[PDB]
């Protein structure tokens with residue numbers, strides 16, 4: 001049956017990379033991203049509309065602590081569907097290098113922001129684990145690929161683990 005999929009990762013970890021590919025390859029999947037959907041109230045609505053059509057839904061947000069993820073777990077329970085999770089394991093170094101690549105942040109005294117931003121997220125980042133009392137069915141950790149782009153095989157490999 002259909003299921004809700006939580007992406008969890010630092011800025012620049014590759015969450016959009018992955019979720020975009022998934023929805024491209026699989027038409028029974030939809031993607032909730034705030035850069036495309038705006039407010040959270042709006043994201044919740046879309047999420048509800050997709051579950052109403054028994055579609056799978058993937059949540060492209062840092063989802064950096066229990067509170068952030070609950071929103072979606074809560075909606076999933078509403079439609080009696082499970083919630084799995086994909087944690088991107090890319091480290092502060094990797095993300096930092098990716099964020100510099102984009103060169104769209106102020107830079108100089110008071111630091112290069114974006115590295116700052118990353119640092120702020122890092123300090124509030126609580127990924128799901130065995131112990132957190134959240135009601136997630138399965139947590140899979142995903143390591144970075146050599147390739148900047150996400151292969152169909154990579155998507156398949158992830159989905160194959162529930």
Ligand SMILES: Nc1nc2c(ncn2[C@@H]2O[C@H](COP(=O)(O)OP(=O)(O)O)[C@@H](O)[C@H]2O)c(=O)[nH]1
Pocket residue numbers: 009010011012013014015016017018098143144145146147148149
């Ligand atoms: N090598 C490698 N680069 C990746 C991977 N995932 C994403 N990237 C790159 O990292 C950058 C940030 O990815 P993006 O999806 O925007 O990150 P998000 O901010 O977590 O949604 C982009 O340049 C991607 O090409 C991965 O698995 N491996």
Ligand SMILES: [Mg+2]
Pocket residue numbers: 015016017060
């Ligand atoms: Mg993104």
